[PDB]
Symmetry: D2
Subunit: 251 residues, 4 copies
């Protein structure tokens, strides 16, 4: 409690799954939060299920939309005050090998997973620098930003891109005394509704040859590391990768 | 507050600097703590400065002493109950290149930095497994476990050793459902009394070519990540490296 | 000599600098080579300076051009026979931080550095698999695929993307017994004509805080590791990163 | 051929398996070689099977023996001239988890795998620096220096130690213009007589969940990368890790 007092956060794709868990924990720890998503009926219900409008609101936004990012920041500033924290969580996956990836699939996945993160990071630096906010940008990568998967070619590309681009941002902000930190979070397999809609997926992911703990994680596992990174507790951490994967990348 | 309720922790080298900060934060979050050190006059004062004997006590111990580790665990169990958490923090450094390292220096440094961590990890697994404690072993490595330094040859060796040995332990505990997690923490440069006793050291470490943030960290920077790893918040994290270095390894 | 006998290679951006050195060494070791570039006057001169048309030819191509890639492969097959080796070397750099990167700059850099490599890797797998060629795709990444640089945001992104996407490809080819290997090469600073056209660049890159050897490399340094990876000597290497950087990433 | 002309190399544990393959290829490429081993009957036969005494000789040596290292260098200098190349290949493995490792096992494994490599690296720097030899120290690590294995605790420790200690050495030699390079080689599973004496081992190692290529490697796979690193072709490579593992660490 109170670990995020005074912070104002934007969480993209925060209406379901991991994003929603992060939003929930952020509000519990004193942050004011704006969550984004594509469908207003879902977003408005999600916000209300967490708290009141003085605590959390919803903004309809596709992270691939460059102009919408501006409106998103202006809207959050109008509701809560200067933004201190950005969690770039929205993302999509295609289940194809590099060999079988269509150009259309390639471009659509990179629009959300890479362009989107770039647009949010760029703008976040511009709006949060030099304001004494103890600002923090948390970019969601994945274990797929460390290792390959034969059936996630484009996704691998996007997550590898986010991992290193984030280091460039971290360094520039640090060297210029911007008071903005940038770090990546790398979840392993996490139980989300999606996973539940895919019979046999959880069991395959839980095999010891994949996840040594023999079970997959839950959204709160990612929420707690995000609280640490958004908080002033992590004031000396920037340009780093934080992995929560049940041992997946240790073998 | 309450993030470590019920946990019982041993912190080696916990009478000064980083170890003391970890102990302090652990007690603040509800853990019972046993700190170790070489000098009883310092250790007893350190404990008292943090809390009462029902909260924290001191045990005289050199981490290179295999037999003493047993006594250390027996003593903590007698004072607080079953041990759930071990922070292997004690370590020493020699300022020599591989070329100029004497065999004596080599062996003494590895006795504390590597043998000591092995002895504590081995015993910790044996004493903490299968007890439903949500057990966690936090092994202190360093940025020097990721990158070389021309004047820290032996230290590099020890920290590289701890980094990967910890992954072996993590995997074995995970695969056997031992309910023990093992992770490493990698501090960059941190302001400790030692550093203060070395004129010009802080300034050299703060140069942007070394630490991009242009300043070094403080003991609490390491304490907060240790709270996260000792807590049940990190229940899906094992075999991973957590870096808090002001950007040192990002460039 | 004879280390690449029978191999047929495409090297993108092979008319100057690093690409030209790779082409030169490939021809010396018995490979037949097709080099690409944007300007035919330069390309045709480059080819002739290395060998005869039975050894090396030029094809005008921009790696961002998806359709041209097909023509490129058809043209090489017509001149030399089935393609066994692809070096994805063409790339551009923008000297901007993430904060200052325009969207136009972002898209143009990714078109060459990421889309281009994807288009070539995808097609290479399709054309080279299951032909017993001992096929090898060498994707040029960079030290900037491991660490950030505050003034190379987009470039970092592209090189981080290539690094991990290549692992996905390697795995899929290995698991399917395609007889195609995929690896990345990571040059540090190398003296090319470009560098020479930038007064003070070589000296800045040679500072010990950047390149510990105190000098930058030369194109042949990259050519020799590419010979190894294209040859059957590296038949058990796939999904790996090969770094030739004068110590840059070791500190 | 001729890739190692003029080089004088010591290869520890060079009487069998990987070491012998390296020695064989070194002699083929023009190097003069001294191989070491524990049994003279085996060593003398091994040398003779490769070439004449003007090309290759045997020296009885246990790499854990500090004093013997001096005699080893003096003996090689007397036979071939100044030593330019050192391959620290000798090593042993214990098949135990950290939990089940005896202290005796711990110390004996580190004596060979870590102390031995330190003794050879230290002395190699001292004897090879500043002689214009294009000197190179190749330290044999392993995929087990990157990832954990639940049943190779001590081995993991030793290989993680070698990986980072080597970077310290590389940096010191580079910064001081010693003309000595230090790099590590990381083999995945390789078919050696040992493996053959263990029924079911090769099949277990060849499973796709372990080695994606579906088969293990052969000693020449390691020999060829060692030729590259010992040669002047790799003159700009130092402090780096070279992985040849059939995709093991890519997933
Ligand atoms: Mg793995
Ligand atoms: Mg660095």
């Amino acid at each position: 409690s109170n670990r995020l007092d005074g912070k104002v956060a934007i969480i993209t794709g925060g209406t379901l799954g991991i994003g929603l868990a992060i939003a929930t924990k952020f509000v519990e720890e004193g942050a004011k939060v704006m969550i984004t998503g594509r469908h207003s009926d879902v977003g408005e219900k999600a916000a209300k299920s967490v708290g009141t409008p003085d605590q959390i609101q919803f903004f309809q936004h596709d992270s691939s939309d460059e102009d919408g990012w501006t409106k998103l920041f202006d809207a959050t500033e109008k509701a809560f005050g200067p933004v201190s924290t950005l969690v770039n969580n929205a993302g999509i996956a295609v289940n194809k090998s590099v060999e079988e990836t269509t150009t259309a699939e390639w471009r659509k996945l990179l629009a959300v997973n890479l362009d989107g993160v770039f647009f949010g990071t760029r703008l976040g630096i511009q709006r949060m620098k030099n304001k004494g906010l103890g600002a923090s940008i948390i970019n969601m990568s994945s274990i797929e930003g460390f290792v390959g998967d034969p059936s996630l070619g484009a996704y691998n590309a996007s997550k590898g891109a986010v991992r290193i681009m984030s280091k460039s941002a971290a360094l520039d902000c640090a060297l210029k005394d911007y008071d903005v930190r940038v770090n990546t979070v790398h979840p392993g397999y996490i139980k989300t509704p999606l996973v539940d809609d895919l019979p046999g997926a959880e069991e395959a992911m839980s095999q010891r040859t994949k996840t040594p703990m023999g079970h997959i994680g839950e959204p709160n596992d990612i929420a707690y590391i995000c609280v640490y990174l958004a908080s002033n507790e992590s004031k000396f951490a920037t340009g780093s990768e934080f992995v929560v994967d049940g041992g997946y990348t240790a073998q």
